């Protein structure tokens, strides 16, 4: 499949996908999130539970920082959803230009850092990620991810494929990427 490159930023389904994610990040329900919180979730929570090495944690942090700065986040900056979504439009545009240029995207580099903590991850690793990050705590959802994606010869997921899927899921609302997270993310 050719990844869908055209954006669809006014589609209510793309809005809802990021709204779901925003509200998941807004744990205290006050309508605003900060880079501080996102990086703490990355480093203090996820990497600790995954038992990442100090270096892996740092590398992952740098990637999370760059990724979310790309959507307008910053330390001490309290962002509400409309500005966050505007940031995602900018991130998606920038990422697609990199993709066109065959330059690694920030979503790819984040994936590299996640995968390294685990270029392939197993279903059981993905199920753990889903619980620890909280993005997909249902193991059935994680099974759906693996059904959905094109897997390697062992039934494992490669970062190139996950990145293709994430371009379509997070940036372009590619129908080929629908269901990447099962019912865990709309």
UniProtKB/Swiss-Prot annotation:
Gene3D superfamilies reported for this sequence: EF-hand
Gene Ontology MF term list: calcium ion binding
Any one GO BP annotation for this protein: bioluminescence
Domain EF-hand, by residue range, is 13-48, 49-84, 106-136, 137-172
The UniProt annotation places Ca(2+) 3 binding at: 150, 152, 154, 156, 161
Q: What does this gene product do?
A: Ca(2+)-dependent bioluminescence photoprotein. Displays an emission peak at 470 nm (blue light). Trace amounts of calcium ion trigger the intramolecular oxidation of the chromophore, coelenterazine into coelenteramide and CO(2) with the concomitant emission of light.
- Name the protein family: Belongs to the aequorin family.
Name of the protein in question: Obelin
């Amino acid at each position: 499949y050719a990844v869908k490159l055209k954006t669809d930023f006014d589609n209510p389904r793309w809005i809802k996908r990021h709204k779901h994610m925003f509200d998941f990040l807004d744990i205290n329900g006050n309508g605003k999130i900060t880079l501080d919180e996102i990086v703490s979730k990355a480093s203090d929570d996820i990497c600790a539970k995954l038992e990442a090495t100090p270096e892996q944690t740092k590398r992952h942090q740098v990637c999370v920082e760059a990724f979310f700065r790309g959507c307008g986040m910053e330390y001490g900056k309290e962002i509400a959803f409309p500005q966050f979504l505007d940031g995602w439009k900018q991130l998606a545009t920038s990422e697609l230009k990199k993709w066109a240029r065959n330059e690694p995207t920030l979503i790819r580099e984040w994936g590299d850092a996640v995968f390294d903590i685990f270029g392939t991850i197993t279903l059981d690793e993905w199920k753990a990620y889903g619980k620890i990050s909280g993005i997909s705590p249902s193991q059935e959802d994680c099974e759906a991810t693996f059904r959905h994606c094109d897997l390697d010869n062992a039934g494992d997921l490669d970062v190139d494929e996950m990145t293709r899927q994430h371009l379509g899921f997070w940036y372009t609302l590619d129908p080929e990427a629908d269901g990447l997270y099962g019912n865990g993310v709309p």
